[PDB]
Structure formats: structure tokens, C-alpha cells
Amino acid sequence: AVVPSTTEHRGTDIISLSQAATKIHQAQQTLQSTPPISEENNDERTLARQQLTSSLNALAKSGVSLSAEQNENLRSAFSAPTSALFSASTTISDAEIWDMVSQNISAIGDSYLGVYENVVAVYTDFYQAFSDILSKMGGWLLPGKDGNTVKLDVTSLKNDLNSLVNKYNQINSNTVLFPAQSGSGVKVATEAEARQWLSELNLPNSCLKSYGSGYVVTVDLTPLQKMVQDIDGLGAPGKDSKLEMDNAKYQAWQSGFKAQEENMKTTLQTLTQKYSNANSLYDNLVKVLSSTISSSLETAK
Numbered sequence: 001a002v003v004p005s006t007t008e009h010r011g012t013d014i015i016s017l018s019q020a021a022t023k024i025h026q027a028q029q030t031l032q033s034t035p036p037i038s039e040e041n042n043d044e045r046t047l048a049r050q051q052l053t054s055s056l057n058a059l060a061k062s063g064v065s066l067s068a069e070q071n072e073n074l075r076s077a078f079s080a081p082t083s084a085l086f087s088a089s090t091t092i093s094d095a096e097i098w099d100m101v102s103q104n105i106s107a108i109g110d111s112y113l114g115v116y117e118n119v120v121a122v123y124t125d126f127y128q129a130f131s132d133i134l135s136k137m138g139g140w141l142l143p144g145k146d147g148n149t150v151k152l153d154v155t156s157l158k159n160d161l162n163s164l165v166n167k168y169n170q171i172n173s174n175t176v177l178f179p180a181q182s183g184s185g186v187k188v189a190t191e192a193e194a195r196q197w198l199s200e201l202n203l204p205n206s207c208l209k210s211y212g213s214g215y216v217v218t219v220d221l222t223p224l225q226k227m228v229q230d231i232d233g234l235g236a237p238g239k240d241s242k243l244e245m246d247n248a249k250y251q252a253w254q255s256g257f258k259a260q261e262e263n264m265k266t267t268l269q270t271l272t273q274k275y276s277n278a279n280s281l282y283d284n285l286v287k288v289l290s291s292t293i294s295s296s297l298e299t300a301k
Contacts, residue, residue, distance in 0.1 A: 004301060005301055006299045006300075006301045007297070007298075007299065007300055007301065008065060008300060009064065009065060009296070009297075012062065013062055013064045013065070014297075016055075016058050016059050016062045016064055017059070017064060017293055017296060017297055019055055019058065020055040020056065020058070020059055020289075020293055021290065021293050021294070021297075022055075023048075023051050023052045023054070023055035024052055024055070024286060024289050024290045024293065025290065026048060026051070026052075027048040027049060027051065027052040027286060028283065028286045028287075028290070030044060030045060030048035031045055031048060031049075031279065031282070031283065031286075032283070035120075036116070036117035036118070036120045036121045036124075036275065037120070037121055037124050037125075038121065039121065041121070042114075042117050042118060042121055045117055046114065046117075049106070049109040049110075049113075049114075052105075052286070053102060053105070053106050053109075056098060056101060056102035056105070056289075057098075057099075057102050059098045059102075060095055060098030060099045060102055063094065063095050064094070064098070064296070065094060065296075066094045066097065066292075066296065067295070067296075069295075070292050070295055070296060071092065071094060071097055073288065073291075073292055074097055074101055074288065074289075074292050075092060075097055075100070077285065077288045078100055078101045078104045078105065078285065078288075079100060079104070081104060081107075081108070082104060082107045082108060082111060082112070084196055085111055085112065085115075085193060085196045085197055085200065086196065086200065087112070087281070101289070105282075105285055105286075105289070108281070108282055108285065109282060112278055112281075112282075113278050113279060113281075113282045114180060115177075115178055115179070115180060115197065116271075116274065116275040116278040116279070117275070117279075118177065118178070118180040118181075119177045119178065119201065119271055119275065120271060120272055120275045122174065122175065122176070122177055122219065123177065123219055123267075123268055123271050124268075125174070126168055126175075126219045127264055127265075127268050129164050129167075130164060130224065130261075130264060133157075133160040133161060133164060134261070136156070136157075136160065137157070139153075140152065140153040140156060140157055140242075141153075142242075144244060144246075145244065148246060148247050149244050149245060149246050149247070149250075150244070150245060150246075150247070150250040151241075151242040151243065151244050151245075152234065152242060152243050152245065152250070152253075153237075153241075153242045153243075154231050154234055154237050154242065154243045155237055155242075155243075157231060158228060158231045158232070161224055161227055161228050161231070162228060164224060165221050165224045165225055165228065168218065168219050168221060169221060171186060171209065171211055171216060171218070172186070175218055175219065176216045176217070176218060177197075177201070177203075177207070177216075177217045177218060177219060178193075178194070178197045178201075178216065178217040179193075179216065186211050186212070186216070187216075188211045188212060188213060188214025188215055188216055189214050189215055189216065190214060190215065191208075191214070191215050193215075194208055194214070194215035194216065194217055195208065197217055198217055200274070201217070201270070201271060201274065202270050202274075203217060203220060203267070204220055204222065206220060206221070206222055207219065207220050220264075220267055222263075223260040223261070223263040223264045224260070224264075226256075226260050227257055227260050230253060230256050230257065233253075234249070234253060
């Protein structure tokens with residue numbers, strides 16, 4: 001080829017670089033606009049990453065050239081990471097580096113981000129449910145028949161709470177934070193792994209539960225369960241109606257009920273913030289990617 005061109009890349013190379021940029025961006029847009037709040041949503045995030053992965057393999061497979069800086073840039077940002085499902089972290093060829101990028105980014109997208117997504121999706125759904133019960137408090141609290149007393153429909157409150165605790169007490173694909181429950185038939189992890197993610201999510205050991213050959217991490221039911229305990233503690237209700245109690249008794253019970261609600265709120269917040277940092281971390285990798293692919297298309301003629 002003695003005719004002037006705009007790039008040392010091949011037409012077949014350019015097609016790959018192009019599709020990669022497409023996937024990279026569609027991925028980045030998907031991951032930034034679709035929150036991990038529903039199972040369907042997570043499927044789309046997961047998909048966007050898989051397609052971004054494929055695009056990368058195509059690049060590596062195609063053996064698409066790469067300048068020195070591009071190689072070192074890509075290398076640096078992607079090499080030597082993913083240790084302990086924590087965040088921890090020569091002349092390497094071009095085909096070799098795409099494979100690395102394709103390998104590592106996928107690990108992060110799955111073993112890390114993917115977990116956080118699933119965590120926020122489960123914890124979200126879980127707190128939502130608790131919120132809904134909480135909105136029924138209206139028709140469950142009425143001032144005392146005479147003067148200073150208050151009637152609490154302890155029974156209905158307790159029933160609801162219990163159903164909630166009962167639902168998430170099971171071990172299925174709607175109550176497991178880690179590992180993510182893909183498919184039919186419970187997915188367990190080793191205890192070391194279970195405990196790693198337990199630390200990562202700053203969750204109590206109670207969230208750790210065994211299932212056959214392995215372990216899984218669930219939501220934290222301690223708060224809800226203390227709530228039920230206290231309700232049981234107010235003493236058996238009236239005949240079949242509500243339980244009456246004076247102010248002191250009621251005041252103390254309520255503050256406690258708020259303390260427990262407050263607890264879930266704090267767990268949840270730590271989870272979403274941590275999810276955020278994960279998602280961000282992944283995005284920065286996707287930026288480096290788009291940045292390298294962009295530099296690779298620059299008119300080098």
C-alpha cells in the first residue's frame with residue numbers, strides 16, 4: 001500500500017475499534033443511568049458489561065496495533081488488581097494487553113461491582129418493604145381512650161414485621177446479598193469469601209449463614225427482630241384489639257423502635273455509598289478504555 005492513508009490500522013481493525021467505542025459508551029451510559037434497584041435493571045447492567053467485554057476480546061483477537069504510551073497507559077490502569085474481593089490494586093505485547101484489560105475489567109465488573117449491584121438491589125427491596133409497613137403506623141396508633149395513654153395495634157404491627165423478617169429469613173435469590181443468586185439452586189461461597197465481603201460491606205456476623213457446602217451473606221435481620229422482641233415486650237394486647245399503655249411506656253418503646261429503624265437506615269447508607277464508589281471505580285476504568293481507543297483512532301498519517 002503506497003497510497004496515503006489516515007491510520008496504520010486496518011479497515012477490519014477500524015471496524016473493531018469503532019464497535020468497541022460504541023459498546024464502551026453504551027455500557028458507560030447504561031451503567032450511569034440504570035440504577036441497581038431491580039433484578040431486570042441488574043441484568044441490563046450485566047449485559048452492557050458483557051458486550052463491552054466481547055468488544056474487547058474482538059480487539060485482542062483482531063490483534064489491533066497500539067502505541068507505546070497507549071500500551072503503558074492501558075497496562076498501568078488495569079494490571080495487578082482484584083485481590084481478596086477487596087479493592088487491592090516487562091515488554092508486554094499488544095495482543096497480550098487487550099487480553100489483560102478484557103480479563104481484569106471483567107473480574108471487577110463481576111466479582112466486585114456485580115456484587116454491590118446485587119447487594120443494593122436486595123437491600124433496597126428489603127428496606128422498601130420495611131418502609132411500607134412503617135406507613136401503616138397511621139391507623140395503628142391512636143391516643144389513649146382517656147387522657148394520657150396510647151393504643152398500639154401491636155398485633156398487626158407485629159404480624160407485618162414478622163412476615164418481613166420471615167421472608168428475608170429464607171435463603172433464596174431474593175434474600176442473599178452474596179454471592180449473587182444466578183439460576184435455580186442456591187449459590188454458596190467459601191467462608192473466607194463470605195467473611196471477606198462481610199467486612200467489605202461492614203456487616204455483622206449475623207448476616208453470615210451457612211448453606212450446605214458453603215456460606216452466604218444475607219441482609220441484617222437483627223433490627224427488625226429486636227423490634228418484634230420489644231413489641232412482644234409491651235405485654236400481650238387487650239382481648240383482640242389494641243394494647244393500651246401509658247406515656248412513659250409508649251415513649252420508651254417508640255424511641256427504641258426508632259433506634260432500630262435508624263440502624264437499618266445506617267446499614268443501607270453504607271451499602272449504597274460503597275456501591276457508589278464501586279460503580280465509580282469501574283467507570284474510571286471505562287474512561288481509560290475510551291481514552292485509549294480514542295487515541296488509537298487519531299489521524300496517524
